[PDB]
Amino acid sequence: PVGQFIPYSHHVTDTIISTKNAEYLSVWKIDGRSHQSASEADVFQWIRELNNTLRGISSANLSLWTHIVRRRVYEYPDAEFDNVFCRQLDEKYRESFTGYNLMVNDLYLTVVYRPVPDQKKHRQESCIKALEDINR
Amino acid sequence: TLGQSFKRYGAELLSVYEKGGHAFSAPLEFLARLVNGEHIPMPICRDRFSDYMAVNRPMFSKWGEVGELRSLTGLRRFGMLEIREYDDATEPGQLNVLLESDYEFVLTHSFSVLSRPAAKEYLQRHQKNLIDARDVATDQIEEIDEALNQLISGHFVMGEHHCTL
Numbered sequence: 001p002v003g004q005f006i007p008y009s010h011h012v013t014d015t016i017i018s019t020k021n022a023e024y025l026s027v028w029k030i031d032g033r034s035h036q037s038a039s040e041a042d043v044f045q046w047i048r049e050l051n052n053t054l055r056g057i058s059s060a061n062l063s064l065w066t067h068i069v070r071r072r073v074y075e076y077p078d079a080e081f082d083n084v085f086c087r088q089l090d091e092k093y094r095e096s097f098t099g100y101n102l103m104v105n106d107l108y109l110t111v112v113y114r115p116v117p118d119q120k121k122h123r124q125e126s127c128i129k130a131l132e133d134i135n136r
Numbered sequence: 137t138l139g140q141s142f143k144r145y146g147a148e149l150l151s152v153y154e155k156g157g158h159a160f161s162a163p164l165e166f167l168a169r170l171v172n173g174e175h176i177p178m179p180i181c182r183d184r185f186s187d188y189m190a191v192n193r194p195m196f197s198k199w200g201e202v203g204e205l206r207s208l209t210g211l212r213r214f215g216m217l218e219i220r221e222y223d224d225a226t227e228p229g230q231l232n233v234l235l236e237s238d239y240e241f242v243l244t245h246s247f248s249v250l251s252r253p254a255a256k257e258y259l260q261r262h263q264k265n266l267i268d269a270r271d272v273a274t275d276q277i278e279e280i281d282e283a284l285n286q287l288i289s290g291h292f293v294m295g296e297h298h299c300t301l
Contacts, residue, residue: 011270
């Protein structure tokens with residue numbers, strides 16, 4: 001079902017979460033490049049370099065997922081500076097809060113192993129070593 | 137014994153203020169807030185008070201969703217949560233998060249003692265069931281037998297806790 005299919009039950013290790021059907025998951029938080037301030041030929045070169053890095057990924061029922069989130073980050077502490085002068089300048093800059101794009105984007109990628117007891121354990125160890133090489 | 141232990145707790149035994157004025161019953165007033173949250177004192181009768189304590193009326197029409205409350209002060213709504221999968225750690229700031237707590241909650245922890253034959257049976261069942269941990273990095277296979285050793289000493293006596301909120 002759309003809440004019971006039963007996709008997260010950790011039974012492997014630190015880096016890997018399991019499912020019911022021995023599908024295996026790991027997550028990478030990804031900060032990105034300064035391509036708003038980089039040469040686009042160099043950006044294209046990094047895309048090719050990352051693509052040649054992707055050529056090391058086999059087709060052994062491996063998949064990658066890329067979740068890119070844009071969220072409000074209102075959790076920034078908006079507090080007093082426990083004085084008078086820097087708190088005054090804090091308020092005089094705090095007048096500049098009227099909007100001005102207070103959301104931030106992040107980037108993340110899931111590595112997923114799919115397979116096609118001792119079979120599960122050895123498949124898990126294969127995911128472990130190959131994923132450690134992937135992460136390195 | 138509890139009055140000895142709670143001497144620094146400011147505690148007070150209830151049901152002593154029964155028979156005030158016209159035969160009031162002190163502790164059932166507490167059960168009133170268990171019944172319906174009202175402060176309604178229920179003096180003694182010629183009847184067992186389970187037959188009449190539901191003055192304001194709870195209702196369980198919703199099947200697991202938010203149920204209802206009929207009262208003379210208005211109509212109210214209520215919902216519940218249970219607790220399971222208890223982490224066996226005991227931090228000092230365990231439920232002191234409810235300082236503001238805009239929920240009007242009632243929190244019920246419940247405990248029954250174990251018969252020491254039944255405590256031995258429970259500890260043996262824990263030793264057979266939970267010793268098969270598969271490379272847990274939090275050291276859970278230590279507390280099971282140490283719990284048996286400390287129920288032998290009597291320090292870590294276990295019992296049937298359940299919680300509701």
